[PDB]
Amino acid sequence: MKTSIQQLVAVLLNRQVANWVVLYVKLHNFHWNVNGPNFFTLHEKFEELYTEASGHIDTLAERVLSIGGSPIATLAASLEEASIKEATGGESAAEMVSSVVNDFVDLVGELKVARDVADEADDEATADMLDAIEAGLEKHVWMLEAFLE
Protein backbone atom coordinates (compact mmCIF):
# COMPACT_ATOMS: atom_id res chain seq x y z
CA MET A 1 0.00 0.00 0.00
CA LYS A 2 2.22 2.81 1.31
CA THR A 3 5.32 3.74 -0.70
CA SER A 4 8.68 4.96 0.62
CA ILE A 5 8.00 8.62 -0.23
CA GLN A 6 4.79 8.33 1.83
CA GLN A 7 6.35 6.47 4.75
CA LEU A 8 9.16 9.01 5.01
CA VAL A 9 6.57 11.55 6.12
CA ALA A 10 5.41 9.44 9.05
CA VAL A 11 9.07 8.76 9.92
CA LEU A 12 9.99 12.45 9.95
CA LEU A 13 6.84 13.20 11.94
CA ASN A 14 7.75 10.55 14.53
CA ARG A 15 11.22 12.08 14.80
CA GLN A 16 9.55 15.21 16.14
CA VAL A 17 7.20 13.18 18.31
CA ALA A 18 10.34 11.72 19.88
CA ASN A 19 11.95 15.16 20.20
CA TRP A 20 8.94 16.67 21.94
CA VAL A 21 8.50 13.68 24.24
CA VAL A 22 12.10 14.28 25.32
CA LEU A 23 11.52 18.05 25.60
CA TYR A 24 8.37 17.59 27.69
CA VAL A 25 10.58 16.12 30.40
CA LYS A 26 13.58 18.36 29.71
CA LEU A 27 11.45 21.48 30.14
CA HIS A 28 10.05 20.01 33.37
CA ASN A 29 13.66 19.51 34.44
CA PHE A 30 14.40 23.20 33.94
CA HIS A 31 11.02 24.16 35.44
CA TRP A 32 12.02 22.26 38.58
CA ASN A 33 15.74 22.94 38.91
CA VAL A 34 16.08 26.56 37.82
CA ASN A 35 17.16 28.95 40.58
CA GLY A 36 18.53 32.45 41.05
CA PRO A 37 16.83 35.91 40.81
CA ASN A 38 14.92 34.91 37.68
CA PHE A 39 13.50 31.78 39.27
CA PHE A 40 9.87 32.87 39.16
CA THR A 41 10.06 34.19 35.62
CA LEU A 42 11.81 31.09 34.26
CA HIS A 43 9.84 28.64 36.41
CA GLU A 44 6.79 30.10 34.68
CA LYS A 45 8.35 30.24 31.20
CA PHE A 46 9.36 26.59 31.30
CA GLU A 47 5.82 25.56 32.30
CA GLU A 48 4.47 27.53 29.34
CA LEU A 49 6.92 25.64 27.12
CA TYR A 50 6.29 22.12 28.40
CA THR A 51 2.56 22.81 28.15
CA GLU A 52 3.14 23.62 24.48
CA ALA A 53 5.31 20.49 24.25
CA SER A 54 2.40 18.41 25.49
CA GLY A 55 0.31 19.90 22.69
CA HIS A 56 2.89 19.18 19.99
CA ILE A 57 3.20 15.56 21.12
CA ASP A 58 -0.50 14.92 20.62
CA THR A 59 -0.93 16.85 17.35
CA LEU A 60 2.18 15.29 15.79
CA ALA A 61 1.27 11.74 16.82
CA GLU A 62 -2.31 12.16 15.64
CA ARG A 63 -1.16 13.54 12.30
CA VAL A 64 0.92 10.34 11.98
CA LEU A 65 -2.24 8.32 12.59
CA SER A 66 -4.16 10.50 10.12
CA ILE A 67 -1.77 9.56 7.32
CA GLY A 68 -1.70 5.86 8.15
CA GLY A 69 1.38 5.49 10.33
CA SER A 70 1.95 4.49 13.95
CA PRO A 71 3.26 7.14 16.38
CA ILE A 72 6.29 6.70 18.56
CA ALA A 73 4.75 5.99 21.93
CA THR A 74 7.33 4.72 24.42
CA LEU A 75 10.17 6.48 26.20
CA ALA A 76 12.62 3.91 24.85
CA ALA A 77 11.71 4.67 21.23
CA SER A 78 11.64 8.42 21.92
CA LEU A 79 15.16 8.36 23.34
CA GLU A 80 16.26 6.23 20.42
CA GLU A 81 14.91 8.52 17.69
CA ALA A 82 15.20 11.98 19.28
CA SER A 83 17.98 14.31 18.16
CA ILE A 84 17.42 16.33 21.33
CA LYS A 85 19.67 15.48 24.34
CA GLU A 86 18.39 15.26 27.94
CA ALA A 87 19.35 17.78 30.60
CA THR A 88 22.60 17.26 32.50
CA GLY A 89 21.08 18.16 35.85
CA GLY A 90 23.61 20.87 36.61
CA GLU A 91 22.59 23.66 34.22
CA SER A 92 22.60 27.20 35.60
CA ALA A 93 19.55 29.37 34.85
CA ALA A 94 21.34 30.99 31.90
CA GLU A 95 22.53 27.64 30.57
CA MET A 96 18.94 26.37 30.71
CA VAL A 97 17.71 29.27 28.56
CA SER A 98 20.73 28.87 26.29
CA SER A 99 19.98 25.13 26.05
CA VAL A 100 16.39 25.76 24.96
CA VAL A 101 17.68 28.23 22.38
CA ASN A 102 20.07 25.59 21.03
CA ASP A 103 17.36 22.91 20.95
CA PHE A 104 14.75 25.14 19.31
CA VAL A 105 17.31 26.27 16.74
CA ASP A 106 18.08 22.62 15.95
CA LEU A 107 14.36 21.84 15.64
CA VAL A 108 13.80 24.78 13.29
CA GLY A 109 16.40 23.30 10.98
CA GLU A 110 14.86 19.83 11.20
CA LEU A 111 11.38 21.25 10.67
CA LYS A 112 12.50 22.92 7.44
CA VAL A 113 13.86 19.61 6.15
CA ALA A 114 10.74 17.66 7.17
CA ARG A 115 8.43 20.21 5.56
CA ASP A 116 10.35 19.94 2.30
CA VAL A 117 9.99 16.17 2.38
CA ALA A 118 6.28 16.44 3.19
CA ASP A 119 5.81 18.95 0.37
CA GLU A 120 7.54 16.59 -2.06
CA ALA A 121 5.15 13.81 -1.05
CA ASP A 122 2.32 16.25 -1.72
CA ASP A 123 1.44 16.12 1.98
CA GLU A 124 0.77 19.84 2.46
CA ALA A 125 -1.32 19.28 5.60
CA THR A 126 1.71 17.78 7.31
CA ALA A 127 3.97 20.56 6.05
CA ASP A 128 1.54 23.16 7.38
CA MET A 129 1.39 21.66 10.88
CA LEU A 130 5.18 21.49 11.01
CA ASP A 131 5.32 25.11 9.82
CA ALA A 132 3.08 26.23 12.70
CA ILE A 133 5.45 24.61 15.24
CA GLU A 134 8.42 26.18 13.44
CA ALA A 135 6.96 29.69 13.47
CA GLY A 136 6.33 29.41 17.20
CA LEU A 137 9.88 28.27 17.92
CA GLU A 138 11.39 31.11 15.91
CA LYS A 139 9.42 33.57 18.03
CA HIS A 140 10.51 31.87 21.26
CA VAL A 141 14.10 31.96 20.01
CA TRP A 142 14.06 35.74 19.61
CA MET A 143 12.69 36.20 23.14
CA LEU A 144 15.05 33.74 24.84
CA GLU A 145 18.09 35.23 23.09
CA ALA A 146 16.98 38.75 24.07
CA PHE A 147 16.79 37.54 27.68
CA LEU A 148 20.41 36.37 27.45
CA GLU A 149 21.73 39.64 26.01
How buried is residue 19: exposed, middle or buried, by Cβ count under 10 Å (0-12/13-18/19+)? Answer: buried
Residue 43, interface with a copy of itself (CB under 8 A)?
A: yes
Provide the 8-state DSSP code for 3. -
Closest contact distance (angstroms) between CB of 86 and a copy of itself is 4
Residue 1, interface with a copy of itself (CB under 8 A)?
A: no
Q: Is there a binding annotation on residue 62?
A: yes
Tell me how far apart the alpha carbons of residues 27 and 20 are, in angstroms, rounded to a whole number: 10
Residue 113, interface with a copy of itself (CB under 8 A)?
A: no
How buried is residue 98: exposed, middle or buried, by Cβ count under 10 Å (0-12/13-18/19+)? Answer: middle
Determine how many CB atoms are found less than 10 A away from the CB of residue 81.
17
Closest contact distance (angstroms) between CB of 84 and a copy of itself is 11
Report the interface residues with a copy of itself, using CB under 8 A: 21-22, 24-26, 28-29, 31-41, 43, 45, 54, 57-58, 61-63, 65-67, 70-71, 73-76, 78-79, 86-87, 89, 112, 115, 122, 124-125, 128-129, 131, 134-135, 138-139, 141-143, 146-147, 149
